[PDB]
Structures are given as structure tokens and as C-alpha cells.
Design a protein around this ligand. Sequence first.
Ligand SMILES: Nc1c(C(=O)Nc2nnc(-c3ccccc3)s2)sc2nc3c(cc12)CCCCC3
Ligand SMILES: Nc1c(C(=O)Nc2nnc(-c3ccccc3)s2)sc2nc3c(cc12)CCCCC3
Lengths: 81, 81, 81, 81
Amino acid sequence: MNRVSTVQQLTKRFSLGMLQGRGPLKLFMALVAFLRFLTIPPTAGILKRWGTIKKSKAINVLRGFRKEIGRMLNILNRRRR
Amino acid sequence: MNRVSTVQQLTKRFSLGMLQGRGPLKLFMALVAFLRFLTIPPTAGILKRWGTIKKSKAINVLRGFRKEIGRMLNILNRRRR
Amino acid sequence: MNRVSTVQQLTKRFSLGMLQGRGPLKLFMALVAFLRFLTIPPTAGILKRWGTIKKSKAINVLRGFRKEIGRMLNILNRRRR
Amino acid sequence: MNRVSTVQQLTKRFSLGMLQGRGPLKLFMALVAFLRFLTIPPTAGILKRWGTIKKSKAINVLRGFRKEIGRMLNILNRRRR
Ligand SMILES: Nc1c(C(=O)Nc2nnc(-c3ccccc3)s2)sc2nc3c(cc12)CCCCC3
Ligand SMILES: Nc1c(C(=O)Nc2nnc(-c3ccccc3)s2)sc2nc3c(cc12)CCCCC3
């Protein structure tokens, strides 16, 4: 039903608060990964929350991210030869 | 100081055009990974660039991101809780 | 109760859609006035809606804006001598 | 073409810092007028700049804005509906 977002829909979803480390743990961890991929320093709010996340839950989320990059690599590899 | 970004600095860097698939390949790929991590549908402009991506360069970028997820697991491994 | 906004509160209120000419008539007219004050060209969406607004209602809103600039001038004049 | 702005162009021009009271006096005064038109409370940074404004320059800017409201009334006067 909803396979494509509009730019307006994404701006509605990605509020300024997430840049201060607000939001669901999965959103926060995805944003930290995004900044680290780009070597962009975190905000004070992101660094504060980075210190308080639960080790085991954060590790579980990151294993999921590692798998998802694997899925993306499978799509691109299966596209060329 | 370049250990922390201001929210102002991040809003400046992450211009609206990146939601239409504009920018350096590393920025584009980091955004695509971020959206896939969160199961957020891409925009038409993101999907068009995904479809026409230089596959070898994109694979190299994603391999680097996967190494960075490993580095994030290694940071969290050191914690007691 | 609410005499001051946070930056986050204002970003919540001022969605991307208003730059496309979406929103209450008063919001739209305030934005058109803001752009005209700065001699910034409108977007296609703003120019589209500018053509469809009701003359008498739009004029009423603008008379209110004219009065409000008068109130602001009264505050600044009463501050110096 | 400089008869229309893109939404992208406007997001570029209207940086987050202006919500903290940063920018050219004309930009600051246009934003203060816009918020007052809509009865939206200012931020602490906007209020601080309002309190310390160069009153003569600010009055000159607002007189120009009031002339522009007149020009907008003159445009709408010409319409049949
Ligand atoms: N530019 C963005 C956004 C954006 O510009 N949102 C805006 N919302 N309102 C805006 C605005 C700006 C000026 C006037 C009126 C409204 S811009 S949201 C967003 N989310 C992401 C990105 C960018 C933006 C890319 C970085 C990865 C996180 C996801
Ligand atoms: N920058 C603004 C806004 C803004 O940056 N909103 C954002 N919302 N989400 C953003 C974002 C950006 C990147 C990543 C995640 C979230 S920026 S809203 C807004 N509203 C006004 C102005 C600016 C902004 C000034 C012009 C007069 C209209 C009122």
C-alpha cells in the first residue's frame, strides 16, 4: 500500500528532537550508525544518550543493522554478474 | 572543538536535497541504510538513484559501513552494562 | 502559561508543506508577507494558492497585519525617548 | 529563473539559527512580524535580540514592511474576486 515516501512525509517523521538523541532506541541507534558511517561528530544530546543505552539491547539492534547491510550487499552483488 | 556537532551544524549539513537522493555517494548510501534499518520507504528520487548506482563503488561503501557496525559492537562490548 | 517557544516547538509547527502553500489562510498570508518583506520569490505551490485566495478575506487578513506592524512600531517608539 | 524559488532553495535560505534570533536585521524583523501575525510565542534567543535591537534601524525596517503590506492590498484591490 505504501512502498514510496514523499519528501514531505519524511520531513514529518524526522523531527529536530532526534538530532538531540530523542526517540525510539532503534531510531537513535540508526542515527548514531548514520553519523559514524559519515564520521560526523554527535550532538551533546546524542552523546548523553549514547552513555545510558542498555548494552545487550543496543548490541541486538546493531546485529540487525549488520544483517541489513548484508541484505543490501546481496541486492547489489546479484545486480552485477 | 570537533568532538561535538551543534544541532545547527547538523541541520546545515543534512539539506532537504538528500531526501531526493542528492549528494556524495557515501551520504546517499548512509541515508539508504538508515531508512532500511527503520523499514522507512524511500522517496522516488532515492529509489531512482538506487536503481542507477555505480554498483562497485556502492559495494565498497557498504563494506565500510559494515566494518563500522563491527566497531560499534566492539565499543559496546567493553561496557559492564 | 506559554509566553516562550523552544526552537523544537517552532520546527514542529512550521512543516515543509507551508513552503508549498499549504495550511490555514492566515498562515499562508503571513508566509507570503514574510517572503515579500524579504523580496524572496514564492514557490510554485505558493504562487498557485496566491491565485485562488478570496479577495475580501485576504484583504481583511492584511489589514490585521498592517495593524500588527503598527503595534510593533508603537513598542519600539515608546522604548526610545 | 528568479520568478520562482524551489522548496529546496527556501530550506537552504531559512536556516535553524534564524529561530534563535540569528541573521540580518531585516530577516530577524520579518520573522518577528510573521510570529506576531500568528500570535506564536518567540524563542528566548528571538526575545533577547528583540530586547537589544538597534531601535532606529528596526523602525526603518518595519516602516518598509508596512509599505509592503500596502502594496499587497493594492495587488488584491485589482482582482474582481
Ligand atoms: N532536511 C531534513 C528535514 C527537513 O528539512 N525538515 C524540515 N521541516 N521543516 C522545514 C522547514 C524549513 C523552513 C521553513 C519551513 C519548514 S525543513 S527532515 C530530515 N530528515 C533526515 C534528513 C534530512 C532531513 C537526512 C539526514 C538523516 C535523517 C533524516
Ligand atoms: N529551519 C526551520 C525549520 C526546520 O529546520 N525544521 C526542521 N525539522 N526537522 C529538521 C531536521 C533536519 C535534519 C535532520 C532531522 C530533522 S529541520 S522549521 C522553520 N520554520 C520557520 C523558519 C525556519 C524553520 C524560518 C522561516 C519562517 C517560517 C518558520
